[PDB]
Amino acid sequence: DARAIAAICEQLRQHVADLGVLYIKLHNYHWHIYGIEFKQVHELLEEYYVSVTEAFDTIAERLLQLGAQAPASMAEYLALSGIAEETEKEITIVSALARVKRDFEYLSTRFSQTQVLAAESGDAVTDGIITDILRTLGKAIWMLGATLKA
Amino acid sequence: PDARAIAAICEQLRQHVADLGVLYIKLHNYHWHIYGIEFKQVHELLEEYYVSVTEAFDTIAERLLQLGAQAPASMAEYLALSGIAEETEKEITIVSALARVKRDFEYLSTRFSQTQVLAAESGDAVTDGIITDILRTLGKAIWMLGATLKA
Amino acid sequence: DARAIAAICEQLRQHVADLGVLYIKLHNYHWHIYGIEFKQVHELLEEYYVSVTEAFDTIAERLLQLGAQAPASMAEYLALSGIAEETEKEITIVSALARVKRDFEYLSTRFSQTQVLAAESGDAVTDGIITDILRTLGKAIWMLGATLKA
Amino acid sequence: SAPGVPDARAIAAICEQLRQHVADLGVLYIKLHNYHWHIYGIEFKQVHELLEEYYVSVTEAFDTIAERLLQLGAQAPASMAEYLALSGIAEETEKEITIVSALARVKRDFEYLSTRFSQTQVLAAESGDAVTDGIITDILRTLGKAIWMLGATLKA
Amino acid sequence: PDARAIAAICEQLRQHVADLGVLYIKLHNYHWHIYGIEFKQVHELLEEYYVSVTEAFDTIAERLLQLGAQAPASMAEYLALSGIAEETEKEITIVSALARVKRDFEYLSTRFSQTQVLAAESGDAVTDGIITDILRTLGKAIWMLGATLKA
Amino acid sequence: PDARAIAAICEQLRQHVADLGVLYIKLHNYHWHIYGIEFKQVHELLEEYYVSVTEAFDTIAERLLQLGAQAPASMAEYLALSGIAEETEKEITIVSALARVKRDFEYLSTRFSQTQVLAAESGDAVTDGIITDILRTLGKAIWMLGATLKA
Amino acid sequence: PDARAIAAICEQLRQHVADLGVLYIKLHNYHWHIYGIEFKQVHELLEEYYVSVTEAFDTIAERLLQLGAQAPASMAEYLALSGIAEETEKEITIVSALARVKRDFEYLSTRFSQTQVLAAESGDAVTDGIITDILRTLGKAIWMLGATLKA
Amino acid sequence: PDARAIAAICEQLRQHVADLGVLYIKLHNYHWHIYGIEFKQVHELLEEYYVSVTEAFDTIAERLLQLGAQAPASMAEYLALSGIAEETEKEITIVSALARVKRDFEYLSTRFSQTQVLAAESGDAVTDGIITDILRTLGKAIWMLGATLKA
Amino acid sequence: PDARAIAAICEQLRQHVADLGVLYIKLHNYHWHIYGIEFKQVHELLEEYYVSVTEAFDTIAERLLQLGAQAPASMAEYLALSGIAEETEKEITIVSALARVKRDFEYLSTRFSQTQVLAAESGDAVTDGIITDILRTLGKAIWMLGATLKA
Amino acid sequence: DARAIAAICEQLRQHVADLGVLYIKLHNYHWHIYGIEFKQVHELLEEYYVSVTEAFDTIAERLLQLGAQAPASMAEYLALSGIAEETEKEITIVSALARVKRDFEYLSTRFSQTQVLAAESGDAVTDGIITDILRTLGKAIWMLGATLKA
Amino acid sequence: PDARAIAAICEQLRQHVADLGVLYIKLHNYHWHIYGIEFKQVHELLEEYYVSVTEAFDTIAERLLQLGAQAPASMAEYLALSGIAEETEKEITIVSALARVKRDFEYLSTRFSQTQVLAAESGDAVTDGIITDILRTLGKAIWMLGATLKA
Amino acid sequence: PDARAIAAICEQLRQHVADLGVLYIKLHNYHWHIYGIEFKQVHELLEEYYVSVTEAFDTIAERLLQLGAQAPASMAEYLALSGIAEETEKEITIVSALARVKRDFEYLSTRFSQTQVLAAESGDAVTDGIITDILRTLGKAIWMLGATLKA
Ligand SMILES: [Fe+3]
Ligand SMILES: [Fe+3]
Ligand SMILES: [Fe+3]
C-alpha cells in the first residue's frame, strides 16, 4: 500500500521535527530552571534530552529505510514541528516540568497515531519502534504527573 | 575579567552555542544522507562528531550561565545568531560531506580562537581552558579530515 | 475507548496479585527443595523470583500510568490471586519445578488474554509490556518442560 | 547454651524470632512497593528510588534470615497467609499518599524492626549463636543508618 | 485457523532456521574470501553479521521448540529446506560480496514478514515480537548495505 | 620448504574445518533436543562447546588461508569432506547426547593429533601451536565428559 | 592484657590453619576424582570451596601473626596438628565426596565456634569477627550440602 | 620575577592548602548536621564536594612540594593560615548550609584567581593549569548552588 | 535500655572522630614529607591509610549522629579532644614516619577496644560491629608496619 | 607408547607434589618475612603461590586426562616431593627470595625434563602445558636474580 | 650444542629486538604520514601494529635477559643490528604504506622462523613458544594485509 | 599572523619528538638492566614512564602534523636532533638509573617550558595546553624521583 508508507513517512518526518525541537527545548529548561530541586531536575532533563535525541535518530533512520530522506535542518524542523520553542529563560522547576509533561503528552498522542497506521498497514518494524518510544514516554509522563501532583 | 570583557566574551559564547547547535543537526544530515563504499565508517565518524559537538554545546552554554548570562535556547535564536549555513540538500557524497564539515570545523576554530584570545587577555582562565580544550579536539579532527580528503 | 482501559486495568490488577503470590511461592521452593540438584535449582528459583518481581513492578507501574492504583498489600493479593500458595515445606525438586511450570502456564494464558485485549484496543504499550513477559515465560515453560520430561 | 551448641530453649526462641522477622520483612517488602507506587510530590523521583533501594535491601534481609532459619533446622514461613498471621506490621491500605507521610511510616516500621531485631541479637549473643548474631547485627546496622537518614529528612 | 495457524508458523520457522543456518556459513565464506582495500572493515562487518545471524538462528529455533515442534538440526535438512543458495566461489570482490548479502537479507526480510503477518493475525504475540525484532535489525543492515553500495 | 608437507597439512586443515562445521550444528541439535533433570546445565555446556568449536572452526580456516589455500565454505563441501555423521534424531537423553559428543571430540582429537605431528615434523610451528591449543581444550572436555558419564 | 586467653586463642588458630591446609588439599582430591552425571557442577563447587578455604586459611594465619605468634607453615606441622584425616582414596562417588566435606565442614564449625567463644569472652573482638565471618560461610555451605544430600 | 614570583605563589598555595583543609572538615559538618526533606541529595552532594576539595587539597600541596617548599600539614597551621571560618553550629538548615558553602566556594574562587594571575604573569604554566582546573570545578559548583538557592 | 552507657559510648566516639581527624592530616604530612628510596611505595601506602582513616572518620561520626548526639566538626574541637599529637616537622625519614603511624595506630587500637568493650557490655551491637571492623583493619596495618620496621 | 606416557605421568605426579609443597612454603615466607620491603615482597609471594597453585591444578588435571590419578594428600606430597619444607619462621627478605629462586630453578630443571619427554613422545598437549609454566618460571627466576644481585 | 645453541639464539634475539625497535618507529611514520580516504581505519590499524610490535619487542628482549645476555638498548645499536630500512619519506599513499609493512612483516617472519627452528632443535621450549606466538600474530597480519592489497 | 612563531614552535616540537623517542628506548634500557632489592618496583615505574613518554611522543608529533609540518620519524633523524644521550651501558644500579632519568626529565622540562613560553606569547593556545599537560606530569615525576633519591 503506497498510500500507507507515504502516510507513515509524513508522520515520521513530523516526529523528527518535534523531537529535534524538544531536544533544544529540554536544554533550555536544563539550563534555566532554578529552585531547591535544581540538581535533580537538571539531571533529569539531561536524561530526557538524551532519550529524546535517541528517538530522534532511530525514527529518522527508520524514515531513511522506508526510502524517504529525513528533515535535517532547524529551518525544516521549525516548519514541520507542532511544538512551540521556549522563549523565556529563568523558569521555575514545576513550571518547566509541567511544560515537558505537556510536550511529552503531545508527542504521545502523535506517536500513537503513527503506531495505529503502522499496525493497520503491517509495518511491524515501524510499529515496534514507535511502541518502544511510546513506552518510555508513558513512564516519563506518569512520573512527571506524580512529581507535579499536589 | 572586567565587566566589558565579560560582555564581549558572553557575546562570543552565545554565538558558539548557536553555531554548535546548527552544526549538531547539520552533522546528522550528513550522518543520514551520505552514501558510498566508506558509508559505515563515515556514518560512525559523523556520530562521534555530533556527540563531541553537543558536548561542547553544553559546556559552553553552561559557562555562559556561570558568567551571569542566559544561553540562547531555541532554534529560532540559533538560526538568528549562527554563522553556519544549514545543509539543505540530502543525498550527498562522502568526500563532499567531509569537506563541508572540515570547512565548518575550521570556521569554528577561527571563531573559538578569537574567544580564547579575549579570555586570555582578560584573565578569564576558566573560559580560556574551556575553549582551548575544544580547540584541541577541533584541531585534531581538522587535521584528520584533511588527511582523508588529501588527493 | 475507556471501556477497554477498564478491562485491561482489571487484568493488570490480577497480574500484580498473581505475580506477588508467585514471588513468595518461589521463595518457598527456593528454601525447601532438596535433592542432588539442589544448588542449581535453588539458583534457578532465585532467577525466577527476580524475574517475577521485575514483571510485578513493570505491570504495577503500567497500571499506574493507565490512571489506576495498584493493589499493594498481601490481603488484596490473596483476594485477587488465582494462584494457590504453597502450604507445604520440604518438597522434591521435580515436584517443585512441576508446580512452577504449572503456575507459569497459568500466568501465560492469563497474560495472553490481556495482550489480546491491549492489541484489539490499540494499547500498544501494554501490549509490548505483556508480550515481553510472555516471551520470558515461554522460554521458562519450555525449559522446565525439557528438564521434567521423562 | 555452650560454645558451639545453643540449648534447645535458646535455638527455639531464636527460631521463633527469626520466623517473625521473615514475616515482618515480607509484609514490609510489599508495603514499600505501595509507597513506591503511590507517593506524589515534588520529591517523587528521589523518594521513588529510595523506596526501591529499601525494598531491595528488605528482601535481601528477608532471604538471609529465612536461610539462617533453615540452617538452624527449622522451616521458613513461606506464604502470605502465614506472614499476615505472624507479622506485627500493619499493611498499607490507602493509595495516594504524601511523601513525608510515607517516609514517616517506613521510619516507624524500621524502628519497630530495629527493636525486634535487637531482641534477637541479644538472644543470639547470650546463647553463643555467633552466626545469627552477626547476621542480625549487619541488618541492624543498615536499619540504623536508614532510620537516622529518614529522621534527618523528616526533621522540621 | 488455530492448530492450522501454529502449524503454518512452525513451517515458516523451520525454513527460517534453515536459511539462517545456510547464511551463517555463507557469511563466513565472504568473511574469508573477500579482498580489497576495505578488507578489514568488511571482514569485521561480516563477522558482526554472522554473529547476529546465528543469534536469530538460535532464538527462532527455540521458539519452534516452545511451539511444540522440533527444530531442523543438520546441514542435510538445511540444504533441503533453505531457499538460500550457498556461495560456491572463493576469492570475491567486496562490492560483490556485500551486494549478495544485501540480497539474502532482503530475501530473509520478505520471508520473515510473512511469518510476522501470520503470527500477528493468529495472536501469536511472542513469535510476532521475535520476528519483528529480527526484522528491525535486518532493515537497518539492508539500509546500510544499500548506502555503502550506492553509486 | 617441502611443498608436499604444506599440501598434506592443508588437506588435513580442510577436513578439520568441515568436521568442526558439522559438529557445530550437531551440538545445536543436542543443545535443543536433550531432556532430563540436568537439562539447563547440559544445555549451557553444549553452548560453551559449540562456541568453542566455532572458534576453532574460524582459526583453522584462517590458518588455511594463510597457507595460501582457500577454505571450504559451504555445507555441501562440509558434508562431502566431514568424517562426522550428522545427528538425525531429535529428542535425546542427556547421557546419550554427551556420550556422542565425547565420541566426536575423541575422533577430532586423533585427527588433530595427526596434523600436529605433520606440522611438527615439517617445521610448521604456527599450525603446530594452533592445533595443539585446540588439542588442549579437547583433552580437557573429553576428560570432563568421561568423568560425568562414568558409572 | 590476658596472655592466658591470647595463648589459648593462638593455640586454636594454629590448629585452624592446619585443618584448613589439610582440607584445602582434600578438596582438590574430590575436585579431581569425583565422577558422576553431576560432575561439572560439583567439580566447580569443590573449587569454590577450596578457594574459600584457602581464604580463611590465610586470614586466620595472619590473625595469628598479629597476635604475636608465628603460623604453622609446612605440611609436616599441619599433619601433626590437624584433626582432619586426609583422603587416601581416589575415584569417589559424588554423594560420598559431598558427605565427607559436609562432615569436615561441620567439624571445623564446632572447632571454630569454640574459638569464637574464647575470643568473645576475652574481648578479642577482631578474632571474634574473623571467626564469625568464616562461621557464617560454613553454616551456609553446610546447609546447602545437607539439602543436596537429603533423600 | 623568578625567585620572587615563586615565593609569592608558594605563599598563596600554602594558604589554599590551609583553606581547603578547613573547608574539608566544614563540609563534613554540613554533611552530618543538615536536615530537611532534601537531606539525602544534599548529604551526598556535600560528600562529592569534600571529596573534590580534598583532591584539590592534595594536588596543590604537592605542587607546593614541587616548587621546593614544604606544605603546611597540621590543623594548628591551617587554623593559623586559613581565611575560612569553621562552622561552630550543629543542626543546620539545608538552604543555610548551601548558602555558606557557596560563600566559601566564592571566597576560594577569588583567592585562586589571584594565584592563577600570578602564575600566568610569571610563566608558571603548571601552577596556572592546576589552579585553573580547580577554578573550573568551583565555577560550576558556584553556579549550581546559585541556581538551587535562587528564589 | 541504659542511657548511661550510650553517653559513655558517645563520649568515646566523639574522641575517635577527633583523633581520626587529626591522624588524617598527620598522614598527609608524612605522605608529603617522607624521603628515601622507598618513597613511592610508602607515599602510596600513606594515602591508602588516610583514605581508610577518613572512612572510619565518617562512619564513626555518623554512628554518633544515629545515637542522638552531634559530631565534633571543626579543627578547633578536634585539637581540644584529640589525644594524638600533630606532626610539627616536615622532611622525615621513612622508618621514622612509619614508626610514628604504627604508634598512633596502636594508640587508636587500645582506644577503640575500650569502646568495643563498652558497646559489647551494653548491648550496642551496631557500634560494636562498627568499631570491631575498624579494629580489624588497624590490626592488619599494625602487624604489617611492625613487619616492615622489624630489624 | 605406553611407556612414554608412564614416564610422563611419573614426572607429573612429582610436579604436583613439588608444587603442593612450594605452595605452602611460599605462604611461610609470605607470613614470616620482615624488612623494609615487606609489603612488596609479601604481595609478590602471594602472586607466586597463586601462580603455583594454578600450575598445581593444571598439571594434576593433565595427569587425570592421561588416565592416571593425581596425588592428593600431604602425606603423598611429602613422600614424592624433592622440595624441602621451610622449618624456620622469621626470615630475612633476601634470604626468603634466594630460597624461592632456588626452588623455582629446581622446578625449572625438573619441568624441562618433562617437556623433553613430552616433545620426543609426541605428547603435544603436555608439552605446551609444561612449556607455559616454564615460561612463567623463567621470568620469575630472572626477576628474582635481578633483585638479589649485588 | 648446548651452550653454542644458546649463543646462536641470543644473537638472533638481539637482532629481533633491533628490527622490532626500528619497525616500531617506522610504523609511527606511516601512522602519521599516510593519507587517503581510508585514513582513519589504517591510522588505527598501524597503531594496533606498533602496539603489538612493541609488545614483541619487550617479551623478546626479556627472554634475552633470561638467557643471561643483555639486550641492545639504544637506537645506535638498533641501527647497527637491524636489517630493516627506516622510512625516510613523509607523505605516503595508504597502499604503499601497507605494502611496505607487509614486506617488513614477511622479513620478520622468515627471521623469526629461523630462531624458532634453532630453539626447537636445541630444546629451548620457552624461546620456541615465545617466537611461535609472535609468528602466529605475524601470519594473521600478513594474510590480512595481503587480502586488503590484493587487486 | 606570525608564520615565524609557528616555525619556531615546530622546530621545538620536532626536537621534543626526537628527545622523547630517544628517552623511550633509554627507559627500556634501565627497565631491563637495573638490579637491586627494589628491582620489581623500579622495573614497573620505568615502564609507567616509557608508556607516559611514548604518549607525549605521539601527541606532540600529531600537534606538529596539525601545524602543517611533518614529524621526524626515524631513529636516524632522532639521533641527529636529540639532545639526550643514549645509555651505552647495561647492568646499572637503581639509584644510578633513577638519577639519570631525573636528569633527562629535568632537561625535557626546561626544553618544554621554552616551547610553552613561545606558544603562550604567540597565542598558540592548543600547543600551550599540550606542552603544559606534559610539563605537569614531568613536574610530578621529577619531584617523586627527587624524593626517592634524597639522602
Ligand atoms: Fe544514526
Ligand atoms: Fe548540562
Ligand atoms: Fe518500580
Ligand SMILES: [Fe+3]
Ligand atoms: Fe536464597
Ligand SMILES: [Fe+3]
Ligand atoms: Fe540456545
Ligand SMILES: [Fe+3]
Ligand atoms: Fe574470522
Ligand SMILES: [Fe+3]
Ligand atoms: Fe596473606
Ligand SMILES: [Fe+3]
Ligand atoms: Fe598525594
Ligand SMILES: [Fe+3]
Ligand atoms: Fe557520610
Ligand SMILES: [Fe+3]
Ligand atoms: Fe581444577
Ligand SMILES: [Fe+3]
Ligand atoms: Fe619489560
Ligand SMILES: [Fe+3]
Ligand atoms: Fe597517533
